[PDB]
Design a protein around this ligand. Structure first.
Ligand SMILES: NC(=O)C1=CN([C@@H]2O[C@H](COP(=O)(O)OP(=O)(O)OC[C@H]3O[C@@H](n4cnc5c(N)ncnc54)[C@H](O)[C@@H]3O)[C@@H](O)[C@H]2O)C=CC1
Ligand SMILES: Cc1cc2nc3c(=O)[nH]c(=O)nc-3n(C[C@H](O)[C@H](O)[C@H](O)COP(=O)(O)O)c2cc1C
Ligand code: SF4
Ligand code: SF4
Ligand code: SF4
Ligand code: FES
Ligand code: FES
Lengths: 156, 72, 442, 227
């Protein structure tokens, strides 16, 4: 059902060259597969294990330990709004309510169009400019609840 | 009994002619009602899944969070 | 305080920053006295001489604990058969309220590269890794470009500066766990494993990454190193009249007038930071609490605002200096909700290895949710207090759970009225069974 | 090596840890994550004792006895009130999410978790909130899987992977949703997978062949025999 592409395998072997042990490229291999496919499917665990020479249970334990390695299918764009204490003081709850009103989803769910997946992430390391959001690779700071129905409309 | 299944009831007329007939099997013991404890159901408390009660459907139990779920 | 004259004598970490918040590349970095300390170290200093020089400079760790860097470097084995050594840069920075390393790596990547080079030469470490969090896209891009520029300029790779020292530097982007910042869990995550921390002893200096000797240092410590080796021990000891040598990135965040980060000497009081640099609280806000060093530190009150930002001064007050990035809590923030958010972070960022954190942080979280909804019951505050007492140092496997229970302990100590106001219902976890008379305890 | 447990002097092996040295003396310390064949990892935090600096010390410090060497001139207390309270608290934390399953659990009467719950003296519940639950896996014809009963002591993975060399059992997940099992449903592939029913201190891994015709341990007639 799953087959690694040639570019994925070449990137995984290139990451394997950087470490003493080929096991150490497991997180990078999972992130490569996730970057190419949006998430890590079930056959990808055994594919990564077969390339790296480690058991599939080790790959699955790594993939389920880390929250950024997605293991269920997600939308085209992953909204990751900050949840920690400084953005709590700066009022992330208004941002979360605005996102849930605009998308009609609870956190951890995906829209029916498959466009957005809403996730409460950890502290984004941008606390002096809070509240913070991280769409797929872009960090948006100084969030206001009125800027969400404009911010979400440039991610088609 | 941790399920209140076995109960001693107000009835004493149990005389017999043969001593072998004083060995009561399950069809001689299982009444058609709850007895002295009318509402306790052990299986509503147990976490073991049976028919009509999935994982997370017992009392004071949360739904099973899958290990592959997206929420931290 | 807008009038900040960042001379290199008093601001060794931020004097070469740019006004447009743009990264300083290799030509501009070397123009503003770049790789001078690395040149001096690799052309006129022994590795043991550099270790003793850093030890005499009194450079402590900037990753919260304040352990002395020279003593950590001197704990490496003296065997000449152990020459597969590793230097790791803890660029994780997953603590809530911490944003200093993002600035340092996005705008001055070559300072980190030079510090990694000097520390690797001192430790005789053949390989270096920068364990960076995966949310710092721009920092990863800038660090990779800086490593490429230093490699093509001969500052990294084989036979650096003609000395014969070979050093290769890699950037390892993480996959988002707070426990990965812990150094032994950082080593486990670097090895491609689940980031469970390791018991010590043995410490990573003797048996670290892949069993080899390994030293893990924060970004800011390795940014402090090049100025130490470019100016000297006496200059680093003669910029602050305190027991903590050197400067530190400090700053207030959260409902203040100017939230940000400034480089200040140790012994600077928190009140003058908040009033001059942060500008004080915003309009119509009353200051009620603050955390000195991130989410894992104890809350302090208005009376503790006059203390100097040192390790020992804040240690004596019932807290710890931590990352020295303080967070201000105004009167409009309910302390029960704030501690509930903190404990939710700490409970879901547990690694699951050991029982008290894994099964006692969620109990405290559920108690705090009940107190926030007003559904608290008698014995909840006592349960929180014994959770604090039984999640202290040594009770859990690593230091995540003591740092989790420090805000809870401090908030119960100071703002107990809100926690007691959360309790409204009588205690009950047992329902009535029809044919059974309950044991009516007193 | 000489240790002093509760003011009583014992001669032990200094290469042992304190848990195995004290269990060899007949002292009772509760433990989960330690096994004699697997070593010490300090996960469950159940084996806490109070170590003193010397004979004239009263404050002391709670240490894990499985991770502490039984070096010469050691001073510990098992029945110290702080140590007993901490061990009972560890049992309580394990009890918070444990299912109400002992009558329908094959481990009942043979359960290390039951024994250590009774041994610490914890019998009163004050946790009032929900319990986490887990789905089970099909592990083949020999091992039955019941993940609700897990206390996350990591004994199964340490045995099956580090000791027995198996590859298809692992730990997955995080903070309090740690899952011990296979990556997918299927038969456990190790020839020594059956020792999981004695390695697991709870009823997660149970003898399925015995479970078809189950009876309790006190009802068995045993004999010493040779396979
Ligand atoms: N983002 C951040 O900067 C965060 C910082 N922290 C801080 O980190 C600290 C807790 O972390 P830990 O690593 O557990 O602290 P620690 O005090 O156990 O050790 C810190 C450093 O000292 C070294 N060390 C200490 N004693 C040693 C010895 N006897 N022999 C050899 N090396 C020794 C360790 O190897 C390590 O590099 C706290 O102070 C906390 O405030 C905590 C969370 C986040
Ligand atoms: C739960 C936990 C999280 C930590 N996270 C970080 C981190 O994100 N960055 C960091 O530099 N140190 C972190 N530390 C501290 C490290 O264990 C270690 O002390 C530090 O990375 C290097 O020490 P140094 O300050 O002497 O350089 C963390 C410690 C704990 C217990
Ligand atoms: S305190 Fe225990 S469970 Fe929590 S993060 Fe540390 S080792 Fe893991
Ligand atoms: S594992 Fe032990 S304590 Fe848990 S239900 Fe089974 S017999 Fe009871
Ligand atoms: S399944 Fe059993 S042996 Fe494995 S961690 Fe859970 S309780 Fe321990
Ligand atoms: S608390 Fe939200 S970015 Fe740090
Ligand atoms: S037996 Fe020592 S902590 Fe588990």
């Amino acid at each position: 059902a799953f087959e690694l592409s040639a570019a994925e395998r070449e990137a995984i072997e290139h990451e394997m060259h950087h470490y003493e042990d080929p096991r150490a490229a497991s997180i990078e291999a999972l992130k490569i597969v996730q970057k190419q496919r949006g998430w890590v499917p079930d056959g990808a665990i055994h594919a990564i294990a077969d390339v790296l020479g480690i058991p599939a249970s080790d790959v699955e334990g790594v993939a389920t330990f880390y929250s950024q390695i997605f293991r269920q299918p997600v939308g085209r764009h992953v909204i990751r709004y900050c949840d920690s204490v400084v953005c709590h003081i700066n009022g992330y709850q208004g941002i979360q309510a605005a996102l849930e009103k605009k998308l009609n989803i609870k956190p951890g769910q995906t829209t029916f169009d498959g466009r957005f997946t809403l996730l409460p992430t950890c502290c984004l390391g941008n606390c002096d400019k809070g509240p913070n959001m991280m769409i797929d690779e872009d960090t948006h700071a100084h969030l206001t609840p009125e800027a969400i129905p404009e911010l979400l409309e440039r991610y088609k | 009994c941790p399920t209140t299944a076995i109960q001693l009831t107000p009835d004493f007329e149990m005389g017999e002619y043969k001593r072998q007939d004083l060995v009561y099997e399950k069809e001689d013991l299982l009444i058609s009602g709850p007895g002295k404890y009318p509402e306790y159901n052990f299986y509503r408390m147990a976490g073991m899944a049976i028919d009509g009660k999935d994982k997370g459907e017992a009392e004071n139990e949360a739904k099973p969070i899958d290990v592959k779920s997206l929420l931290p | 305080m807008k009038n900040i004259i960042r001379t290199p004598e008093t601001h060794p970490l931020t004097w070469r920053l740019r006004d447009d918040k743009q990264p300083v590349w290799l030509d501009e970095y070397r123009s503003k006295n770049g790789y001078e300390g690395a040149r001096k170290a690799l052309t006129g200093l022994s590795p043991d001489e550099i270790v003793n020089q850093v030890k005499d400079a009194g450079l402590k760790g900037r990753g919260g604990a304040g352990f002395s860097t020279g003593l950590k470097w001197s704990l490496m084995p003296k065997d000449e058969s152990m020459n597969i050594r590793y230097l790791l840069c803890n660029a994780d920075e997953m603590e809530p309220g911490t944003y200093k390393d993002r600035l340092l790596m996005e705008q001055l990547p070559h300072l980190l590269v030079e510090g990694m080079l000097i520390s690797a030469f001192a430790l005789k470490a053949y390989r270096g890794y920068i364990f960076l969090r995966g949310e710092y896209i721009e920092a990863a891009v800038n660090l990779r470009r800086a490593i490429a520029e230093a490699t093509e300029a001969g500052l990294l790779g084989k036979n650096i500066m003609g000395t014969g020292f070979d050093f290769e530097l890699f950037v390892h982007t993480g996959a988002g766990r707070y426990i990965c910042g812990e150094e032994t869990a950082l080593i486990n995550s670097l090895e491609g494993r689940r980031a469970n921390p390791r018991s010590k002893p043995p410490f990573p200096a003797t048996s670290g990454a892949w069993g080899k000797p390994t030293c893990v240092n924060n970004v800011e410590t390795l940014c402090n190193v090049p100025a130490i080796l470019a100016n000297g021990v006496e200059w680093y000891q003669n910029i602050s009249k305190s027991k903590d040598a050197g400067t530190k990135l400090m700053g207030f965040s959260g409902r203040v007038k100017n939230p940000g980060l400034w480089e200040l000497p140790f012994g600077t009081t928190a009140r003058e930071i908040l009033e001059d640099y942060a500008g004080g609280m915003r309009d119509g806000l009353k200051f009620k609490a603050w955390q000195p060093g991130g989410a894992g530190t104890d809350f302090l009150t208005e009376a503790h605002l006059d203390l100097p930002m040192e390790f020992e001064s804040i240690g004596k007050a019932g807290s710890r200096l931590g990352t020295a990035l303080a967070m201000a809590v105004d009167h409009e923030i309910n302390m029960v909700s704030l501690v509930r958010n903190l404990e939710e972070f700490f409970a879901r960022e547990s690694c699951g290895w050991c029982t008290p954190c894994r099964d006692g942080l969620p109990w405290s979280v559920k108690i705090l949710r009940a107190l926030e909804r007003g559904e608290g019951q008698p014995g909840d505050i006592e349960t929180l207090e014994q959770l604090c007492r039984f999640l202290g140092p040594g009770k859990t496997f690593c230091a995540h759970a003591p740092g989790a229970v420090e805000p809870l302990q401090s908030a119960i100590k100071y703002f107990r009225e809100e926690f007691e106001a959360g309790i409204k219902q009588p205690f009950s976890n047992t329902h009535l069974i029809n044919g059974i008379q309950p044991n009516l305890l007193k | 090596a000489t240790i002093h447990v509760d003011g009583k002097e014992y001669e032990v092996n200094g290469a042992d840890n304190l848990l195995e040295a004290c269990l060899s003396l007949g002292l009772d310390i509760p433990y989960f994550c330690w096994h004699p064949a697997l070593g010490s990892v300090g996960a469950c935090r159940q084996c806490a004792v109070k170590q003193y600096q010397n004979a004239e010390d009263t404050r002391g410090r709670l240490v894990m006895s499985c991770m502490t060497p039984a070096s010469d001139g050691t001073f510990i207390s098992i029945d110290d009130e702080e140590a007993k309270q901490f061990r009972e608290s560890v049992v309580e934390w394990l009890m918070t999410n444990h299912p109400h399953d002992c009558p329908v659990c094959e481990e009942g009467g043979n359960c290390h978790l039951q024994d250590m719950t009774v041994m610490t003296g914890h019998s009163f519940r004050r946790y009032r909130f929900t319990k986490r639950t887990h789905r089970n896996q099909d592990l083949g014809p020999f091992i039955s899987h019941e993940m609700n009963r897990c206390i996350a002591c990591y004994r199964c993975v340490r045995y099956y992977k580090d000791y027995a060399g198996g590859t298809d059992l692992g730990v997955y997940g995080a903070h309090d949703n740690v899952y011990f099992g296979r990556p997918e449903d299927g038969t456990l592939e190790s020839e020594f997978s059956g020792n999981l029913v004695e390695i697991c201190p709870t009823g997660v891994f149970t003898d399925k062949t015995h479970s078809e015709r189950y009876n309790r341990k006190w009802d068995m007639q045993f004999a010493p025999s040779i396979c």
